[PDB]
Design an enzyme around this catalytic site. Structure first.
Site, PDB file in Angstrom:
ATOM      1  N   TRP A  40     -47.874  43.880   3.103  1.00 17.84           N
ATOM      2  CA  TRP A  40     -47.588  42.507   3.527  1.00 17.84           C
ATOM      3  C   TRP A  40     -47.873  41.550   2.394  1.00 17.84           C
ATOM      4  O   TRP A  40     -48.699  41.828   1.507  1.00 17.84           O
ATOM      5  CB  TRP A  40     -48.357  42.115   4.806  1.00 17.84           C
ATOM      6  CG  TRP A  40     -49.818  41.999   4.607  1.00 17.84           C
ATOM      7  CD1 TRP A  40     -50.755  42.965   4.805  1.00 17.84           C
ATOM      8  CD2 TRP A  40     -50.524  40.855   4.178  1.00 17.84           C
ATOM      9  NE1 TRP A  40     -51.999  42.491   4.517  1.00 17.84           N
ATOM     10  CE2 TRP A  40     -51.886  41.200   4.099  1.00 17.84           C
ATOM     11  CE3 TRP A  40     -50.146  39.553   3.836  1.00 17.84           C
ATOM     12  CZ2 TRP A  40     -52.882  40.275   3.719  1.00 17.84           C
ATOM     13  CZ3 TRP A  40     -51.156  38.656   3.413  1.00 17.84           C
ATOM     14  CH2 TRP A  40     -52.488  39.030   3.369  1.00 17.84           C
ATOM     15  N   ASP A  49     -54.105  49.753  -1.982  1.00 17.61           N
ATOM     16  CA  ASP A  49     -55.274  49.995  -1.116  1.00 17.61           C
ATOM     17  C   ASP A  49     -55.161  51.305  -0.360  1.00 17.61           C
ATOM     18  O   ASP A  49     -54.442  51.412   0.613  1.00 17.61           O
ATOM     19  CB  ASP A  49     -55.362  48.813  -0.127  1.00 17.61           C
ATOM     20  CG  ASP A  49     -56.494  48.916   0.868  1.00 17.61           C
ATOM     21  OD1 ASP A  49     -57.457  49.659   0.654  1.00 17.61           O
ATOM     22  OD2 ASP A  49     -56.378  48.225   1.904  1.00 17.61           O
ATOM     23  N   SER A  77     -55.810  51.450   3.728  1.00 14.20           N
ATOM     24  CA  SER A  77     -54.934  50.860   4.735  1.00 14.20           C
ATOM     25  C   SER A  77     -53.505  51.332   4.439  1.00 14.20           C
ATOM     26  O   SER A  77     -53.269  51.931   3.414  1.00 14.20           O
ATOM     27  CB  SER A  77     -55.026  49.300   4.717  1.00 14.20           C
ATOM     28  OG  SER A  77     -54.396  48.735   3.580  1.00 14.20           O
ATOM     29  N   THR A  80     -61.781  48.784  -1.754  1.00 16.27           N
ATOM     30  CA  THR A  80     -63.158  48.368  -1.499  1.00 16.27           C
ATOM     31  C   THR A  80     -63.923  48.389  -2.816  1.00 16.27           C
ATOM     32  O   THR A  80     -63.893  49.362  -3.557  1.00 16.27           O
ATOM     33  CB  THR A  80     -63.832  49.283  -0.418  1.00 16.27           C
ATOM     34  OG1 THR A  80     -63.192  49.092   0.849  1.00 16.27           O
ATOM     35  CG2 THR A  80     -65.336  49.014  -0.214  1.00 16.27           C
ATOM     36  N   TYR A 137     -58.695  43.368   8.723  1.00 18.63           N
ATOM     37  CA  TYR A 137     -59.391  44.159   7.705  1.00 18.63           C
ATOM     38  C   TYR A 137     -60.893  44.012   7.905  1.00 18.63           C
ATOM     39  O   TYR A 137     -61.320  43.191   8.717  1.00 18.63           O
ATOM     40  CB  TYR A 137     -58.993  43.675   6.306  1.00 18.63           C
ATOM     41  CG  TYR A 137     -57.544  43.953   5.990  1.00 18.63           C
ATOM     42  CD1 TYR A 137     -57.126  45.226   5.567  1.00 18.63           C
ATOM     43  CD2 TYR A 137     -56.592  42.967   6.141  1.00 18.63           C
ATOM     44  CE1 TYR A 137     -55.791  45.493   5.281  1.00 18.63           C
ATOM     45  CE2 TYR A 137     -55.258  43.221   5.879  1.00 18.63           C
ATOM     46  CZ  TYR A 137     -54.858  44.467   5.441  1.00 18.63           C
ATOM     47  OH  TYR A 137     -53.543  44.674   5.193  1.00 18.63           O
ATOM     48  N   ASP A 163     -61.362  54.803  -1.022  1.00 20.47           N
ATOM     49  CA  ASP A 163     -60.718  53.513  -0.797  1.00 20.47           C
ATOM     50  C   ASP A 163     -60.691  52.605  -2.038  1.00 20.47           C
ATOM     51  O   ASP A 163     -61.630  51.907  -2.385  1.00 20.47           O
ATOM     52  CB  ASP A 163     -61.401  52.834   0.368  1.00 20.47           C
ATOM     53  CG  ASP A 163     -60.714  51.578   0.801  1.00 20.47           C
ATOM     54  OD1 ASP A 163     -59.656  51.208   0.227  1.00 20.47           O
ATOM     55  OD2 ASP A 163     -61.265  50.979   1.733  1.00 20.47           O
ATOM     56  N   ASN A 196     -50.315  49.288   5.597  1.00 17.68           N
ATOM     57  CA  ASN A 196     -49.266  48.277   5.606  1.00 17.68           C
ATOM     58  C   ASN A 196     -49.078  47.632   4.270  1.00 17.68           C
ATOM     59  O   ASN A 196     -50.029  47.481   3.495  1.00 17.68           O
ATOM     60  CB  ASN A 196     -49.564  47.180   6.615  1.00 17.68           C
ATOM     61  CG  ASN A 196     -49.623  47.699   8.013  1.00 17.68           C
ATOM     62  OD1 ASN A 196     -50.660  48.159   8.450  1.00 17.68           O
ATOM     63  ND2 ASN A 196     -48.546  47.557   8.743  1.00 17.68           N
TER      64      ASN A 196
END
Ligand SMILES: CC(C)(C)NC(=O)[C@@H]1C[C@@H]2CCCC[C@@H]2CN1C[C@@H](O)[C@H](Cc1ccccc1)NC(=O)[C@H](CC(N)=O)NC(=O)c1ccc2ccccc2n1
Length: 326
Positions: free
Chosen positions: A39, A32, A35, A218, A75, A215, A37
């Site tokens: 996780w 992505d 963003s 998306t 998000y 992005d 991070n």
């Protein structure tokens, strides 16, 4: 140079497999660029979405290191809370040692419950990483695991295989012509200036310019509500009683291109790109969504756009490179 294959799920989500820990526990994650991070769900989470996805178990990895730093991410759709930990992450054939990442403890609400993928791997700048967690690509660079400080993304069309993120390289066979380089206007997202959006040489949105991000996470091409309504009106889309921007599949063939001007250069999207087809159910590839910033409201150039343009994300340069897909 690492090569991470992505599954193209329904032209709406692109995710790839990573391994975390020793031995590797596998997860699918969205790669992505909106963003920063990394996780994955963990055994510490009892939320519904954690229950139907793969869960990281630190007690089964000999290389895990706990921290007491907490993590919280909201998000556009979906959110999580968790705790940061360190372990080795196998990504695109690279052993990313000493990678900080989120172990989810809550993943509330339903979107993530239904999603095929387990977690998110952010590819944006450290300035937008929650809890200032080192992003994966920054860790690869810092450890010299890629020789060039850049990565590129090809997203396939028509649900085909072959989507990839190339870590530390650019592969010219995926595109036509030479790459056009666009300076990053604001470093956080991969944010750039859009100069205009036109159709039949008439400007239809982003008069005087506007900020956009590139992005991969998306699905649709999103922008401010009012501007999008106008575009929807322009392409003859109208919401049905079920909340879906419907379009007659005949328009794919009548309609003109919509042109994105970026750093003074034209990037057309044909109707076959900005209209989604599925056996005579055609929806709009545009979606109204308001993303307020200091600068201005953001546009999001999602998979609808990226499928048409091989994209290079250059951290050495702070530039995005674009060229039409092969
Ligand atoms: C934009 C939308 C159509 C809703 N799509 C998505 O959000 C998809 C949905 C996917 C499925 C579930 C989990 C997330 C993935 C990735 N995201 C894309 C993903 O790339 C997304 C793009 C974006 C940016 C800004 C604002 C909204 C949306 N990024 C984000 O959502 C980043 C994540 C982060 N904390 O860095 N969030 C934000 O930047 C964010 C979210 C809410 C806010 C509220 C107030 C003020 C500022 C705010 N900032």
């Amino acid at each position: 140079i690492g090569d991470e294959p992505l599954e193209n799920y329904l032209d709406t989500e692109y995710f790839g497999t990573i391994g975390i820990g020793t031995p590797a526990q596998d997860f699918t994650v969205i790669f992505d660029t909106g963003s920063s991070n990394l996780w994955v769900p963990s055994v510490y989470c009892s939320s519904l979405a954690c229950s139907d996805h793969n869960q990281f178990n630190p007690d089964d990895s000999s290389t895990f290191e706990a921290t007491s730093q907490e993590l919280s991410i909201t998000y556009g759709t979906g959110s999580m809370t968790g705790i940061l930990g360190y372990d080795t992450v196998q990504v695109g054939g690279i052993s990313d040692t000493n990678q900080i990442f989120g172990l989810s403890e809550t993943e509330p609400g339903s979107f993530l419950y239904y999603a095929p993928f387990d977690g998110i791997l952010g590819l944006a700048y450290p300035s937008i990483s929650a809890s200032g967690a080192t992003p994966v690509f920054d860790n690869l660079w810092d450890q010299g695991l890629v020789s060039q400080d850049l990565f590129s993304v090809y997203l396939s069309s028509n649900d085909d295989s072959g989507s990839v993120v190339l870590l530390g390289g650019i592969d010219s066979s995926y595109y036509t012509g030479s790459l056009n380089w666009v300076p990053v206007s604001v470093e956080g997202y991969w944010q750039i200036t859009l100069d205009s959006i036109t159709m039949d040489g008439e400007t239809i949105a982003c008069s005087g310019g506007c900020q956009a991000i590139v992005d991969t996470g998306t699905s649709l091409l999103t922008g401010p509500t009012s501007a999008i309504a106008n575009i929807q009106s322009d392409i003859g889309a109208s919401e049905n009683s079920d909340g879906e921007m419907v379009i007659s599949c005949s328009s794919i063939d009548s309609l003109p291109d919509i042109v994105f001007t970026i750093n003074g250069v034209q990037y057309p999207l044909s109707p076959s790109a900005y209209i989604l087809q599925d056996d005579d159910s055609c929806t709009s590839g545009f979606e109204g969504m308001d993303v307020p910033t200091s600068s201005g409201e953001l546009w999001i150039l999602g998979d609808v756009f990226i499928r048409q343009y091989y994209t290079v994300f250059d951290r050495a340069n702070n530039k995005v490179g674009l060229a039409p897909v092969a």
